[PDB]
Amino acid sequence: RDALSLEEILRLYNQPINEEQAWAVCYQCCGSLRAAARRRQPRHRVRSAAQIRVWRDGAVTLAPGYSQCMETEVIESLGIIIYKALDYGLKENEERELSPPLEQLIDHMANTVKRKISAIRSYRDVMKLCAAHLPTESDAPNHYQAVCRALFAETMELHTFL
């Protein structure tokens, strides 16, 4: 229709996502999560890749102060899922060497941890590490949206034509 889950995406290629797509999904997903928080929609954890929806327009959404789910738990469940997607279907021996800025983003999201950075406390924090990946940080909104739009268009050519 207008969205593909990250789980359908991984099954269609039978390959992992690439590094740019990981940065993009974190940024886009965190922007949606931050907007949902403001609309006071309820926080929930990313239990699996099936909950991460990439849309035709490059949005990434998450399908079903202090409360029963902190921002950092949501962010940790996201960095774990993105780690899984970067590692999708690879033997232990053909394991993945991530560029240091990315490994470090994911570590700090997952709580699995200038060479060393600070702790992440919020969606904004994650989106700023993502921006910092670009030579011109003000390009991030358009850039990460463009990455996911491309990923959606590419993956629809396999989803529509099994």
Side-chain angles (χ1 to χ4, degrees):
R1 65 227 184 74
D2 285 328
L4 288 170
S5 78
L6 173 58
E7 159 176 300
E8 310 171 69
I9 294 166
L10 294 169
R11 203 213 62 104
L12 293 162
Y13 290 106
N14 203 34
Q15 304 178 264
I17 60 166
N18 66 41
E19 289 202 13
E20 199 65 20
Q21 291 159 349
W23 287 103
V25 170
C26 299
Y27 177 98
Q28 287 299 94
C29 194
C30 286
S32 297
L33 290 171
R34 179 179 61 182
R38 313 192 61 183
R39 298 182 170 107
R40 322 207 74 215
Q41 296 155 355
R43 281 172 208 128
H44 41 276
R45 296 163 181 82
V46 194
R47 321 293 189 172
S48 83
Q51 271 174 272
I52 299 172
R53 282 65 217 301
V54 188
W55 296 81
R56 177 176 296 290
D57 69 358
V60 184
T61 58
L62 180 60
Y66 288 75
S67 62
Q68 277 158 310
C69 189
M70 307 297 287
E71 275 191 30
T72 55
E73 298 176 79
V74 179
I75 286 158
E76 154 164 343
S77 61
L78 178 65
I80 284 169
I81 290 307
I82 302 311
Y83 190 75
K84 290 187 190 310
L86 288 167
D87 204 30
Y88 191 72
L90 306 175
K91 301 311 306 308
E92 46 272 276
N93 73 77
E94 54 184 47
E95 222 204 45
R96 189 157 193 166
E97 263 101 308
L98 301 196
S99 73
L102 183 60
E103 200 197 333
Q104 174 184 45
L105 176 63
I106 290 179
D107 288 349
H108 295 80
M109 298 179 65
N111 305 304
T112 284
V113 346
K114 40 98 160 69
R115 268 318 142 288
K116 189 195 241 55
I117 61 167
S118 285
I120 295 180
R121 289 186 45 204
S122 69
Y123 302 130
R124 186 183 166 68
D125 282 356
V126 172
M127 291 173 79
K128 298 161 56 58
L129 302 158
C130 297
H133 165 66
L134 303 184
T136 303
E137 300 192 354
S138 54
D139 292 333
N142 198 95
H143 175 62
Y144 297 125
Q145 189 200 35
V147 176
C148 290
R149 199 195 309 127
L151 168 65
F152 182 91
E154 194 197 346
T155 311
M156 273 307 269
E157 59 198 51
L158 309 172
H159 175 270
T160 297
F161 297 99
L162 309 169

